[PDB]
Design a protein around this nucleic acid. Structure first.
Ligand SMILES: [Mg+2]
Lengths: 50, 84, 402, 50, 51, 1340
DNA sequence: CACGTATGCTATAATGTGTGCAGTCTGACGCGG
DNA sequence: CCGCGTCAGACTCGTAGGATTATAGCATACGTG
RNA sequence: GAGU
């Protein structure tokens, strides 16, 4: 995102900084749930061939 | 065929009862209408109990079926076999 | 096992739909072409003695009427599974192999050489296997044993059955109706519909949602066919054969044991009491405390004070395996000497939390009992936490303070 | 590649158990193939000693 | 440290040493009394200016 | 402030005046379902809509027809309470008046033939409770609203479909509410196609031919025109200046007498404007230019009358010459351009294989019904029945509305059927988008995503039931007799009842209400789901839809959704958000006129929001003037920046409106990372109610609203004074001013005691009032399970210190003091439900007797004569609760048992043992038992005793009702008699039973006496009928499942105390598991001697970035410091004055405290009750983003005489010496989550095995083993542990003889491995052979 | 003979299906025109 | 080549049980105690 | 719904 978060946690983010943070956070968390399938499937293919 | 047709008369009668009672009828209410034994009505309704697939996965989730839970009760464990 | 005598032959869908065609590849017949023949849209020439009409050349309904008067007799062209089976029976693999090899020498283009080498290897392997092409077509249909498609009563007088039984019921009904329609000498349009019907039900039985619409239950969901039990994750291999449910296994929540030494873990008494049940009974009989197995059982149910001392005796020097999911590398399973504790959670040593990626925010672990002297030795020698420090991936210590 | 290499091993039990099981079994049935059980997969499937 | 000990001394010593290190580590961690207050999170005076 | 607030006021640190209060939180649920049942006369809604949509229907023949009149819901035969206990669904019978009308065939439309009108029953519809649940089979269930793509039009394009080319192919999709889908799309050759229900592809012009459009007309619709006049000899063209743009001039462009552009020269802006200013219309041009222009219309030779050139034909020198000489000196060709006006339809007509309309209809027909011989009838009928039939197609008002707005029409509502123009306009816009003007929508924009609540979904399934019955009706009407056949004989209730039961039952959106916590219920009912039918699937879900969309601002919480695969789909509604009338989301904003911020509020939809510039709530207002600062932070078009003050159109109402309910409860959310906050909010829902409802010190303010709105607390309907408090009930007498002149005016609330929740927790209501207290309307009378004096109390605050401790708080692990356990504050109640079913088998009926083979006297002591355990009885695993016995059939006794039973005699009896016993390791107290018997089977002695209780207790309850109602009613008549003929104690002398004969003078007060006299007799007869009903229902023999003779349900109550392995957390996403319960002697303690309750690891803060917990702790400590000062002052008993001085100063601390709380209005006693509560710790409210700032918190600590750092010197309880440095100490509000180790602990040696596979079963409830899966196997393979592996594959799993042999060996010491072959493998082979593949074992 | 299970015939004319969902995933690898 | 099709898509744990419809009305026929 |  072009506007980064200038503020920090001790100071406290405002409504809009918090909202802006959400997107990235959630993207990360969804990546845990969703992408590990594909990581693990790679592991499985490796294992099968070795 | 005899059982099926008997059961059907029990059903049609239940429908008339349900219209006027507002409520779906009990076994004994249907029996009182036919002037017949409650045991007869009950046995017939038991026969109408339709089957469930052992393979159907449980809880709206394609996780595991009935088979996955359902034991062999006749087969005792290594405990029972070793006791014999 | 049992079997069913089919009135009309039927194609094995696996050797039809599952690509490469196999049956189509072997006859050099396009798959669509085979299907038009099977579903009785059009005839196929099995042997046109008159070179005027050659082999495997499709004729529509009206095309069959023209040469009927003209050539007739000296050309045999038929329809359905019968036709294809016959075409298969009469093809001589040896001869056509040599013919195609001769053609391979003329002007072998890259893709042509691959397709021809493919059929060559098919024909070669077919003769080597001792398989016959007739067998692509089923006249006899096998029936799976009862206990592998069980019909069991639930408690309430309900019954539960396998979907296979429903699929088989369709096949039998349709096949037996076909026998009846043949006994009654029925007009050919109705015979055709029943033959198609039979093939549809067989295909559903073997592999449901393969050819077309999977036949569905009242629930909307496609019935589970034979192939579905072998195929995919829910399949036999993945689910019941490369991995298994296992006795002498338990699980609980884990918590820290800072006081523990590296080769130890906190094992709840109640958990260990169950896991080591037979060892306790055996020792009870050596002590002569328990007269019989049944007495020992009732003695452990009552959880007598002597039983605790005996349990303490057995668990000495006996390794248990701790596992945490997902088990990404081998150190996700490690062996420890158990230390019996009052309290329902397993206590894990801090330094090996790294290997497990175990953090105590509610994590759980599985416990396994190595039973045999061999397994116990494998656990203590190969799998013991003390013995396995370094990551097998990089040459670094994985037991690192954190 | 890893997938095809695993499917190319002489063992059809290893191949079938991995993936593509319908195709693997048609191939093996027609070829009349025999597995003499060299690999670990194969042994574990039959519950034998690694 | 642990690596060096493994290479020179061997397995037995390293295992004992690792346990020992764990005990003393936690022991001193607690004694230190180390905690997290809002004043530790020091800010830079040049914060508003840079921004 | 209210009377309940006088008891305990929360201190507010908020600064922003809340112009709007939080709405009723379960608004959505209730409004929706209310609309569904609400009978609307014209504008059909819910039920009414379904009837009018289907009805009136006529028969296949057309002579007989059924018409709908009106419906009515019967009152529910069993009320909620009874339904929960019995396990029945709470529903109302649906009776519908219908009129069977028949027409004569000989007369034209002889409507006066036969008209039969009557009321028919057809299904009971489940009713919604007061708090938005449904009671289905005795369990509370919530239907969660769904979110789907709005019916209408939508333009999209697969961004580089063919990856090699990467060309963007645009498509239009018309999505109706009911009907076939209609898709328009481009191909790589830029030809427009049409598809129906994604079938095969057809040229787009084919559909226009279906609508009867000739080629000429089609071109006139989509294209413009280029006219060519042929004068004298030279060719002239009619010119529009702004066509020739971005092009290369092919010939020498000149006009009258000035040459502008040369051959091969680029035509820029300047040239165009020159030409336009000069007023150029006609230009001489070369003949060779025409080659390539397509002629628009047809041209015929007037002489011959034959076609010279057909339309859409590329012109050439020959054609042109021929046309000139026939006598046509003007030629319409297609305006067309590579860049701007693309010739798509032109090229598509060339691909169109159809000619005329009929041909087009046939091809359409042949797509969807391939092979089948087309008939003209069938083609016409098909096409009309696709998108032009009222029956099968309906956009709905929402579809039409969304469609019309997307096409930039003026009229919102209109035809649900597609008109000709509608289609064309969709094609036009698609083409526009292709040219470059316009853009595609997304789907993720909330302007395109609509919310579908319960009422609309029930409406839909009800329409379906109607349609199924309609089929049956039509079929029976056709063949049916006109005279003998009654309407109700044709109707079946079952299809409708089935469809509806299936929705509230089978549907994913309908689920067991999550009720382990008031918050859990309230947020659950405020949920939105993108899953289920007509929505996404987990597999099918991408990343785009899941992630946070700019439109979510104020509508959906960005910080509330499960971390599972349901991450993007399931979502909680934002606080202030509401359902638009058409189903979109909308958020309140305060209108700003000329800088001045009015108190008028406007709810903006997603689409409307993008149009206006909206200032943030954090802008500083200039005391009812305007924005203080000249630059203001605002947003529009989904993007945020600085604006001037007068530019601002609107502003955010509340600082809370961005977040959901759950997230709002988190104080200092502003200082927490969003990840952690997500987990914190999710975990807060799992907080299990403790024994002692403790309020949270460091709250937010939302606590009160949640508790009250959830409906789990009992609140007062009408203000007045409490006449009788009790543990079981509360009777409040209403004030004269609110008290209606009809009834006595005494409200009675029976409180729901110890009841089982769905999560097996305990639901009990406690009274929170004193006897004889004056209470205001809408105050809390009784607290629910996790509420305290009206506020939400999910957990318990306690004294925490942040420091390491010997690794006992290692990775989030928690070291807690024994003190917490001793005080039993985290201890929890669990009410579990055990049932014993007595079924009828083929051999004979199972009996519930105490007479069971092999039972000890110890066991039978607790069982009564019937075989049922007594109420109150303490049980432990293995004890029998309900004795049950089953008839055993023959069993082949091994020769050994023949010999043995001959020796001992002990001939084995006919009855077995299926008794229900206590599950192993659970132990508790039997608190209630319920018995269900069928109507005919002889009742148990115990069942009779329970019915005795119920009958006599019911009589007492109803008798107290009429007694206190009679007493309150005569107390009124006593007062009315005084107004006129006052004789106070002289009237009370003779008995009250002889009172109503006394009247008054002929006035309106004499009529008031008549009203109380009529109601008193009404209540008398009503009491008779109520008691008859009660008695019937108690006698009523229950209709159970077929086969089941009788059922016994036992409710155990267990006291679960906290222990190592249990799970605890705060509201900042800080989890932990209890590792060790340390003796209080060992706990770190401060100088004063006060020991800490919990020691949390500080190493779980910086990595986590949840700093809210630190702030919470500091504010928590200050809150408690003030509490201890108040507590000290109360123990000393200084005086009211002194307490008042301190407390006033305290409330008015903050820099810009919004709420002012003057203690001068409070009377001295009110101050005493307040201080009594505040002593435990002064409760403080930190709103979400409008919270307490660091300065304010430190100021509060100074009033507590606590350090500014909030760190204190602590002493090691083991050594007695101090820790080297100060540690942060204070109160954090923590929760015990549902995850008890008790439920988690499991172990198995040997037990049942699976049916086919023969391997052990799964799950702790079935006594199952853990799975050693592929992952787990690989571990062992790697290590090379071969025997252990084989062990787990064989003796531990399938190998049958191996497992038994191994067990015997283990009992005999020798740990010998005797392995074989797993049975599952055998099965596999057999399954392959059943496939018809010969797979054989070749032995060695 | 009875009890349980089955096969059977009924006489205005009526003569080509539809229906209930499916919702469209993704990067890759082969296979007829 | 293009287009249509088929094939795969991490590992353990959990919770809870459960739902739909309708087949006429009567006379003769076959098998077991 | 729980750790990954
Ligand atoms: Mg973890």
């Amino acid at each position: 995102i072009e506007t980064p978060i200038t503020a920090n946690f001790r100071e406290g983010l405002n409504v809009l900084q918090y909202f802006i943070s959400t997107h990235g956070a959630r993207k990360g968390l969804a990546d845990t749930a969703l992408k590990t399938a594909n990581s693990g499937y790679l592991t499985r293919r490796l294992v099968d061939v070795a | 065929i005899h059982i099926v047709k008997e059961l059907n008369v029990y059903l049609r009668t239940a429908r008339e009862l349900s219209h006027k009672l507002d409520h779906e009828p009990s076994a004994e209410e249907i029996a009182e209408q036919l002037d017949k034994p409650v045991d007869d009505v009950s046995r017939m309704l038991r026969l109408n109990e339709r089957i469930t697939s052992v393979d159907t996965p449980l809880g709206g989730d394609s996780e595991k079926a009935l088979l996955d839970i359902l034991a062999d009760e006749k087969e005792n464990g290594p405990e029972d076999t070793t006791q014999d | 096992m049992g079997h069913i005598e089919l009135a009309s032959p039927t194609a094995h869908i696996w050797f039809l739909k599952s690509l490469p065609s196999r049956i189509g590849l072997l006859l050099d017949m396009p798959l669509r072409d085979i299907e038009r023949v099977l579903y009785f849209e059009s005839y196929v020439v099995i042997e046109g003695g008159m070179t005027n009409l050659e082999r495997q050349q499709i004729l529509t309904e009206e095309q069959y009427l023209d040469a009927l008067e003209e050539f007739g007799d000296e050309f045999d062209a038929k329809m359905g599974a019968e036709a294809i089976q016959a075409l298969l029976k009469s093809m001589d693999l040896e001869q056509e192999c040599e013919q195609l090899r001769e053609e391979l020498n003329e002007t072998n283009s890259e893709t042509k050489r691959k397709k021809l080498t493919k059929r060559i290897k098919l024909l070669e392997a077919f003769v080597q296997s001792g398989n016959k092409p007739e067998w692509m077509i089923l006249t006899v249909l096998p029936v799976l044993p009862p206990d592998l498609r069980p019909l069991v009563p639930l408690d309430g007088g309900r019954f539960a059955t396998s979907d296979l039984n429903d699929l088989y019921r369709r096949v039998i009904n349709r096949n037996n109706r076909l026998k009846r329609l043949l006994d009654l000498a029925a007009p050919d349009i109705i015979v055709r519909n029943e033959k198609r019907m039979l093939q549809e039900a067989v295909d559903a039985l073997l592999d449901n949602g393969r050819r077309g619409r999977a036949i569905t239950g009242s629930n909307k969901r496609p019935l589970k066919s034979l192939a579905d039990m072998i195929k995919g994750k829910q399949g036999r291999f993945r689910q019941n054969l490369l991995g298994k449910r296992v006795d002498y296994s338990g699980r609980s929540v884990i918590t820290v044991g800072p006081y523990l030494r590296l080769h130890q873990c906190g094992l709840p008494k109640k958990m260990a009491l169950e896991l080591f049940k037979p060892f306790i009974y055996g020792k009870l009989e050596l002590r002569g405390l328990a007269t019989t197995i049944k007495a020992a059982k009732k003695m452990v149910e009552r959880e007598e004070a002597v039983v605790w001392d005996i349990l303490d005796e057995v668990i000495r020097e006996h390794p248990v395996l701790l596992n945490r999911a997902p088990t990404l590398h081998r150190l996700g399973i490690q062996a420890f000497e158990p230390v019996l504790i009052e309290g329902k959670a397993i206590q894990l040593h801090p330094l090996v939390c790294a290997a497990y990626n175990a953090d105590f925010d509610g994590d759980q672990m599985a416990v396994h009992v190595p039973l045999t002297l061999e397994a116990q030795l494998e656990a203590r020698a190969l799998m013991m936490s003390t013995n396995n420090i370094l990551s097998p991936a990089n040459g670094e210590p994985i037991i690192v303070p954190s | 590649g890893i997938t095809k290499a695993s499917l190319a091993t002489e063992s059809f039990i290893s191949a079938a158990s991995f993936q593509e099981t319908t195709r693997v079994l048609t191939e093996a049935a027609v070829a009349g193939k025999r597995d003499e059980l060299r690999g670990l997969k194969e042994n574990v499937i039959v519950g034998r000693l690694i | 440290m642990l690596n060096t000990c493994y290479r020179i001394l061997g397995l037995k010593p390293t295992v004992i040493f690792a346990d020992q290190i764990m005990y003393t580590g936690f022991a001193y961690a607690a004694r230190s009394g180390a905690s997290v207050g809002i004043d530790d999170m020091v800010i830079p005076e040049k914060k508003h200016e840079i921004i | 402030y209210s009377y309940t607030e006088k008891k305990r006021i929360r201190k507010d640190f908020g600064k922003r005046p809340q112009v709007l209060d939080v709405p009723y939180l379960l608004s959505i649920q209730l409004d929706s379902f209310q609309k569904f049942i609400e009978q609307d006369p014209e504008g059909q809604y819910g039920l009414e809509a379904a009837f009018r949509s289907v009805f009136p229907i006529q028969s296949y023949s057309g002579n007989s027809e059924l018409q709908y009149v009106s419906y009515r819901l019967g009152e529910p035969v069993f009320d909620v309470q009874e339904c929960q206990i019995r396990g029945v669904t709470y529903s109302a019978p649906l009776r519908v008046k219908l009129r069977l009308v028949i027409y004569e065939r000989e007369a034209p439309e002889g409507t006066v033939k036969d008209i039969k009108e009557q009321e028919v029953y057809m299904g009971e519809i489940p009713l919604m409770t007061d708090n938005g649940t449904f009671v289905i089979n005795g369990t509370e269930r919530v239907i969660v609203s769904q979110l789907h793509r709005s019916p209408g039009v939508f333009f999209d394009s697969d961004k580089g479909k063919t990856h090699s080319s990467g060309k963007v192919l645009y498509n239009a999709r018309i999505i109706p509410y009911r009907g076939s889908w209609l898709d328009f799309e481009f191909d790589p050759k830029d030809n427009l196609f049409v598809r129906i229900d994604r079938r095969r592809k057809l040229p787009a012009t084919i559909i226009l031919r279906a609508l009867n459009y000739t080629t000429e007309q089609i071109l006139d619709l989509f294209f413009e025109k280029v006219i060519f006049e042929i004068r004298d000899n030279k060719l002239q063209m009619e010119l529009v200046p702004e066509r020739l743009r971005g092009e290369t001039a092919s010939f020498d462009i000149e006009a009258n007498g000035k040459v502008y552009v040369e051959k091969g020269r680029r035509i820029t802006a300047r040239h165009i404007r020159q030409l336009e200013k000069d007023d150029v219309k006609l230009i001489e041009v070369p003949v060779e230019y025409i080659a390539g222009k397509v002629v628009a219309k047809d041209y015929i030779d007037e002489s011959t009358g034959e076609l010279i050139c057909a339309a859409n034909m590329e012109l050439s020198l020959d054609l042109l010459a021929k046309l000139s000489q026939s006598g046509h000196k003007r030629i319409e060709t297609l305006f067309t351009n590579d860049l701007d006006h693309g010739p798509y339809i032109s090229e598509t007509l060339r691909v169109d294989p159809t000619n005329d309309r009929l041909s087009a209809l046939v091809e359409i027909y042949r797509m969807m019904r391939p092979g089948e011989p087309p008939t003209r009838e069938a083609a016409e009928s098909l096409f009309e029945n696709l998108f032009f039939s009222e029956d099968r197609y309906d956009l709905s008002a929402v579809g039409r509305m969304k469609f019309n707005r997307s096409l930039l029409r003026e009229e919102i509502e209109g035809s649900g059927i597609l008109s000709k123009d509608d289609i064309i306009d969709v094609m036009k816009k698609l083409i526009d988008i292709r040219n470059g003007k316009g853009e595609v929508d997304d789907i993720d924009h909330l302007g395109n995503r609509r919310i579908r609540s319960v009422g609309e979904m029930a409406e839909n399934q009800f329409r379906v039931g109607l349609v199924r019955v309609e089929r049956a009706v039509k079929e029976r009407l056709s063949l049916g007799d006109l005279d003998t056949l009654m309407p109700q004989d044709m109707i079946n209730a079952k299809p409708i009842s089935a469809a509806v039961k299936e929705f509230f039952g089978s549907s994913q959106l309908s689920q067991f209400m999550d009720q382990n916590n008031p918050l859990s219920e309230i947020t659950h009912k405020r949920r939105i789901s993108a899953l289920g039918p007509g929505g996404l699937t987990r597999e099918r879900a991408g990343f785009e839809v899941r992630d946070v969309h700019p439109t979510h601002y104020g509508r959906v919480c960005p910080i509330e959704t499960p971390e599972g695969p349901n991450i993007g789909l399931i979502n909680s509604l934002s606080v202030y958000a509401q359902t638009n009338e058409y189903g979109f989301l909308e958020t309140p904003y305060r209108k700003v006129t000329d800088g001045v911020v009015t108190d008028e509020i406007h709810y903006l939809s997603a689409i409307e929001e993008g149009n206006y510039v909206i200032a943030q709530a954090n802008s500083n207002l200039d005391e009812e003037g305007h924005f203080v600062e000249d630059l203001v932070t605002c947003r529009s078009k989904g993007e945020s920046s600085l604006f001037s003050r007068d530019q601002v159109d609107y502003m955010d109402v509340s600082t809370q409106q961005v977040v959901s309910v759950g997230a709002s409860l988190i104080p200092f959310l502003e200082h927490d990372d969003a990840n952690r906050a997500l987990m914190g909010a999710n975990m807060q829902r799992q907080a299990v109610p403790t024994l002692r409802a403790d309020k949270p010190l460091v709250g937010t303010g939302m606590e009160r609203a949640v508790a009250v709105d959830s409906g789990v607390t009992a609140v007062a309907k009408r203000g007045g004074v409490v006449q009788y408090v009790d543990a079981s009930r509360i009777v409040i007498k209403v004030n004269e001013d609110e008290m209606y002149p009809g009834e006595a005016g005494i409200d009675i609330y029976n409180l729901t005691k110890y009841t089982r929740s769905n999560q097996n927790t305990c639901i009990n209501q406690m009274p929170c009032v004193s006897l004889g207290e004056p209470v205001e309307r809408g105050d809390v009378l009784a607290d629910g399970p996790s509420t305290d004096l009206g506020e939400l109390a999910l957990g318990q605050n306690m004294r925490v210190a942040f420091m390491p401790w010997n690794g006992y708080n290692f990775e989030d692990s928690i070291l807690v003091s024994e003190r917490v356990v001793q005080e039993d504050r985290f201890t929890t109640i669990h009410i579990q439900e055990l049932a014993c079913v007595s079924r009828d088998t083929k051999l004979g009926p199972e009996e519930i007797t105490a007479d069971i083979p092999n039972v000890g006297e110890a066991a039978l002591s607790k069982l009564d004569e019937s075989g049922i355990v007594y109420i109150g009885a303490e049980v432990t695993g293995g004890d029998i609760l309900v004795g049950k016995v089953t008839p055993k059939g023959e069993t082949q006794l091994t020769p050994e048992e023949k010999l043995l039973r001959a020796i001992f005699g002990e001939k084995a009896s006919d009855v077995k043992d299926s008794s229900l016993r206590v599950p192993n390791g659970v132990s508790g107290t039997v608190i209630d038992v319920q018995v269900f018997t069928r109507d005919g089977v002889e009742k148990d002695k115990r069942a009779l005793e329970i019915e005795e209780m119920q009958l006599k207790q019911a009589k007492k309850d109803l008798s107290e009702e009429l007694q206190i109602l009679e007493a309150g009613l005569f107390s009124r008549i006593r007062a009315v008699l005084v107004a006129g003929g006052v004789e106070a104690e002289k009237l009370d002398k003779l008995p009250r039973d002889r009172w109503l004969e006394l009247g008054l003078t002929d006035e309106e007060k004499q009529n008031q006496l008549e009203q109380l006299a009529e109601q008193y007799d009404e209540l008398k007869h009503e009491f008779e009928k109520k008691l008859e009903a009660k008695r019937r229902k108690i006698t009523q023999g229950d209709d159970l499942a077929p086969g089941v003779l009788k059922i016994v349900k036992v409710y155990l109550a267990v006291k679960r105390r906290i222990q190592p392995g249990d799970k605890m957390a705060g509201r900042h996403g800080n989890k932990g598991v209890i590792s060790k319960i340390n003796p209080i002697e060992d706990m770190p303690y401060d100088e004063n001697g006060t020991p800490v309750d919990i020691v949390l690891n500080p190493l779980g803060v910086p990595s986590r970035m949840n700093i809210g917990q630190i702030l919470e702790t500091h504010l928590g400590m200050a809150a408690k410091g003030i509490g201890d000062k108040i507590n000290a002052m109360l123990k000393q008993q200084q005086e009211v004055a002194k307490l008042r001085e301190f407390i006033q100063r305290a409330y008015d601390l903050g820099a810009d405290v919004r709420q002012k709380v003057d203690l001068s209005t409070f009377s001295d006693e009110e101050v005493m009750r307040l201080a009594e509560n505040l002593r435990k710790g002064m409760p403080i409210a930190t709103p979400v983003f409008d919270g307490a700032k660091e300065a304010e918190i430190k100021e509060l600590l100074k009033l507590g005489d606590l350090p500014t750092s909030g760190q204190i010197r602590l002493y090691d309880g083991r050594t007695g010496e101090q820790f080297e440095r100060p540690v942060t100490v204070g109160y954090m509000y923590m929760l015990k989550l549902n995850h008890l180790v008790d439920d988690k602990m499991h172990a198995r040696s040997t037990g049942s095995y699976s049916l086919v596979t023969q391997q052990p079963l799964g799950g702790k409830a079935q006594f199952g083993g853990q799975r050693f899966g592929e992952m787990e196997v690989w571990a062992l393979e790697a290590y090379g542990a071969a025997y252990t592996l084989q062990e787990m594959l064989t003796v531990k799993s399938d190998d049958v003889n191996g497992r038994t042999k191994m067990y015997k060996n283990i009992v005999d010491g020798n740990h010998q491995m005797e392995p074989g072959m797993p049975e599952s493998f055998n099965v596999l082979l057999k399954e392959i052979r059943s496939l018809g593949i010969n797979i054989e074992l070749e032995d060695e």
